[model samples]
Target chain A: KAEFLAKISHEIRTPMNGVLGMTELLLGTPLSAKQRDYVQTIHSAGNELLTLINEILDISKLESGQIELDEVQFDLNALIEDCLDIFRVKAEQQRIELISFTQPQVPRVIGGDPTRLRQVVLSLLDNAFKQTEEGEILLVVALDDQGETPRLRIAVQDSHLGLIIARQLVRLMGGEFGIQSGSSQGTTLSLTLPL
Target chain B: SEFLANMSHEIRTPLNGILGFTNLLQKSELSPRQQDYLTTIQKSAESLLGIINEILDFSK
Candidate 1:
C-alpha cells in the first residue's frame, strides 16, 4: 500500500477530532449545555455527541480533510515543505511573503516524533499568521550537529495563544521554547528541539 | 455561519438516530416498546433539524 503523509490544518481537526472522540468515548458518557455538566442520564449521549460534532464540524471549515504522518523516521525536508505550503493560502490571503529555510545538514530523513514537530510548527505558524498586522513573516528550521546527537531548532520571528503551548510542549520534550515580544516588530518565539 | 452549520448538524444527529433506529425497529418485532417512543424522538429531532436549516438560510 502507498502511504503519503499529510499535515492537517487545525481548522477541521477541531471537529474531526471532536466527532470521533466524542462519538467514540460514549462507553459511559454525553448531553450538556447550561445543564450540560449535569446531564446525568439518557440526554447525555445526545448532548455530548451533538456538542462534539457541532464543534468538530465547525472548525474543519478552516481546512478540512484526511491527515497523514507518524513518528519513527520521517522526511524532515518533506515535512518542511508541507509546513510552508500549508500556508500558501495566507500568502494570497494577504500580501504577506513568508521566508523559510532549512540547513542542508538537517537531512531529508530524520529521526524522532513527527507529530510533535507538526504540533509545534503549526502552533508557531498559527501565531505568526495572526500577528500579520500588515505583511511579511519569517520562520527558521535547522539541525545543530555541534551538540551531542543532534539538535533541531525552530524560531518564529513574528507573533499569537502560541508561545505558551509551543514552549511548554517542547519543554515537555526537554527542549527550549520561549518568546521575546517587542512593540516595534510583531514578536519572536525562541525554540530548539534537542533530540 | 459555521455556528448554524453545527446547529443543523447537531439537531440532525438525534433526528437521524431516532428515524434510523425507528426504521430498524419497524423491520423487526419492534412494535409495542418502540411504537410509543420512536415517533416522539424522531419527530422532535426532525423538527429541530428543519428549523436549523431555516436559521442557517436566514443567517446567510
Candidate 2:
C-alpha cells in the first residue's frame, strides 16, 4: 500500500505541473471576464488539492515509523509565533481571530525538532480553522510545573486527519498530547514537550 | 527524491509542448465561442496537471 501510494503520487504530479504552468500563461493573455473567473477558480482549487495530498503523504510517512526528527536548538517562541503567522491570512478570510500568548517564564531557547514541532502546530491550527466558522483560535505556550526538567506546554484551541500524524510526532518527541471537545463547545488540543 | 526528479522532468516535457501549442492556438483569430472552447480545454488540462503535482509532492 505504501509503495503504491508513492508511485501513484509521482504519476499524478508529473502531469499536473504542466497543466498549472500552461494555465498561468493562458491567464496572462487577454481573456473574457467569465473565462478569467473560471481559470482563477480552477487554479485555486488545484492548489488546495495539492495541499491535501501533501497532508496525506505526511501521514503516510509518519505511519511507516522511519521519519526522523532533525533536532536542533531553536527559539520556541519564534517557532510558535511563526506557525501562527501562517494562519493569519486564512483567519482573516474566515473572519476568525487568531491569538497567541507566551508565558514570561517560557524559555527563549529550547532543544528539539523544530520542523516536526511546526508541523504539529500547523496541523492543530488547520484543524481548528476547519472546525471554527466564527470564533477565535488561540495558541498558548507555557512551562509546565517549572520543575527540575521543565516541560513546555503548547496548547491550541481548535481541532484532524492530520491529528494522527501530529500525535505520533508528539509521542516520538517524548511529549504528551491531549484533545477535548463537545458538541456546543469548541475543541482544544494540548501538547507537553520536554525542553 | 528520485521519483520526484525523474517524474518531474518526464511529465513536464510533454506538458510544455501541449501548453505551448495551446497558447499559439489562442493567439489566432477565432470567434468568441471558439475562444471559450479553448479556454475550457486549457482549464481542464491545468486542473489535471495540478492534481498530478500534488500527488508527486506527496510521494516525495
Candidate 3:
C-alpha cells in the first residue's frame, strides 16, 4: 500500500509539475477570452491534479507512519479568520450565512500547526456548506473547557461530518476530537491540542 | 514555518481564485448544469487546499 501510494504520488507529480509550471507561464501571457477560458480550464485541471496528488500523499504518509506533527505557538482567532475567508465565499454561494465567534482570554499564541488545523476546519466547513442548500453555517472557537491545557475547541455546525472526519484526522495526529450532536440543535465538533 | 513558508506561494495563490472566483461563479446567472460544474471546480480547489494544509501539518 505504501509503495503503491508513493509511486502514485511520484507518477502524478511530474504531470502536475508540467501543468502547474505551464499555468504559471500562461498567467504571464495575455490572451483573448476564448484563450483565457481555455487557460482557465487548464489551470482548473492542474489545480485538481495537484489536489489528487496531495490526497494520495497524505494517505501514503499515514500508511508509512511518515506523518509528523509540528507544535508551535499560534493565534487561535487569526487562524479561524483565515479559515472563514477561505470558506465563507462557498457558504455565501449556497446562500448560507457563515458566522464565527471566539471567546476572550483565548491565548494570543497556542501550540499547533495552523495550516493543518485550518485544513481540518475548511474540510468540515466545506462539507457543511455542500450538504445544506440553505440556512447558516456557524464556526465556534473557544478555549478547551479542560482548563489550562492550552487547547482550543472548535465547533462547526450545520453542514455535515466534515468536522467529524477533521476531528478524527486530528486524533491520528495525537490529539483528541469530540462531537456533540442531537436531532434538535445540530452538531458541534471540538478539537483539543497542546497550548 | 518551513514548509508553509515554502508553499505559501502555491497555497495562497490558487486559494485566492478558488475563494474569489467561486463566489462570483456561484452568483452569476447560469444554468443548473453550469452551476454544478462551477461547484465541482470549487470542491476540487478545496481538496487541494485541504491537502496542502495536511502536508504542512505533516511537515511540522
Candidate 4:
C-alpha cells in the first residue's frame, strides 16, 4: 500500500501543479468580483489539499525513523510570515483573526531546518484555525533565556496525528513542544528551539 | 524508482504545454469573465502540479 500510495501521489500531483500555477497567473489579470472569488476558492482548496498530502508523507517518514533534517541559514521572520500566509485565506473564510509578532531582539537570521520549523508552526496553526470557529489565533515568537543556552520561543494560540508528527520533528531538531487546552479555554501550542 | 522518475518526466511534458498555452492566452486581449475562467483552469492545473511534486519528494 505504501509503495502504491507513493506512486499514485506523483501521478496526480504533476497535473495539479499546472492547475495551481495557471490559477496564479490568471489571478494577476483582470477579474470580476465573482470571478475573483471562484479563483481564490480553487487556489486555497488546492493548496490545503497539497499540504495535506505532504503532512501524510511526513508522518509516514517519521514513523519509520527515516526523516532527515536540513540545516540552512534563512530569515526567521520572513519564513514565519510566509508560512502563516498559507492559512490567511482560510482564516478569512472562517472569519477568524490571525496575528503574529516577532520580538525585535529575536535574531532575524538563524541556522536550522526552516522547512521543519515552518511545518511545526503550520501544523499548529492548522489545528488552531480548524477548531476556532470564532475568536482569534495568535502566534508569538520571542527569546527564551531560562535555559542554559538561549532559545527562541514560539507560541501558537488556537486549538492532530499532525500534532504528534510535529512534536517528533521538533525533538529531532533539539527543540521542545508543548500543548495546553481545555473545554472552557482554548488551546495553546508552543515550540522552544535553541538559538 | 525508475517508474517514479519516468512518470514525472512524462506527466510534466503535457503539463508544460497546458501551462504555456494558458500563459499565452492570458497575454491576448480577452474579456474579464473569459480571463476569470482561464484563471480557474490555470489554478486547477497548478494544484495538480503541486501534488505531483509532493508525491515525487515523498517517494524519493
How many residue pairs clash (N, CA or C atoms closer than 3 angstroms) in each of the candidate models, in the order given? Answer: 9, 6, 2, 29
lDDT (tens digit, per residue) of candidate 3 on B3-58: 33345344546565655655564675555755555566556556556655665675
**lDDT, ranked from best to worst:** 4, 2, 3, 1
Identify the runs in model 1 with alpha carbons over 4 angstroms from their true place.
Answer: A1-71, A144-150, A159-163, A182-185, B1-60
True contacts kept of each: 0.02, 0.09, 0.00, 0.37
For candidate 3, what is the DockQ?
0.04
Which pairs clash (backbone N, Cα, C closer than 3 Å) in model 1? Answer: A11-A59, A12-A60, A15-A56, A30-A44, A31-A44, A31-A47, A31-A48, A32-A36, A33-A36
Between prediction 2 and prediction 3, which has the larger lDDT? 2
| Candidate 2 CAPRI classification by DockQ | incorrect
Per-residue CA lDDT of candidate 3, range A69-150, in tens? 5577788788888889987677667788889877786666677767777778777777667656677788887777676555
Candidate 2, after superposition: displacement of residue A123 in Å?
2.0
Give me the candidate number with maximum DockQ: 4
* Cα shift from native, residue A90, model 4 (Å): 2.5
- Per-candidate DockQ values are 0.04, 0.10, 0.04, 0.18
Q: What's every prediction's RMSD, in angstroms?
A: 15.5, 8.4, 11.5, 9.3
Top-scoring candidate (lDDT): 4
How does candidate 4 fare on TM-score?
A: 0.56
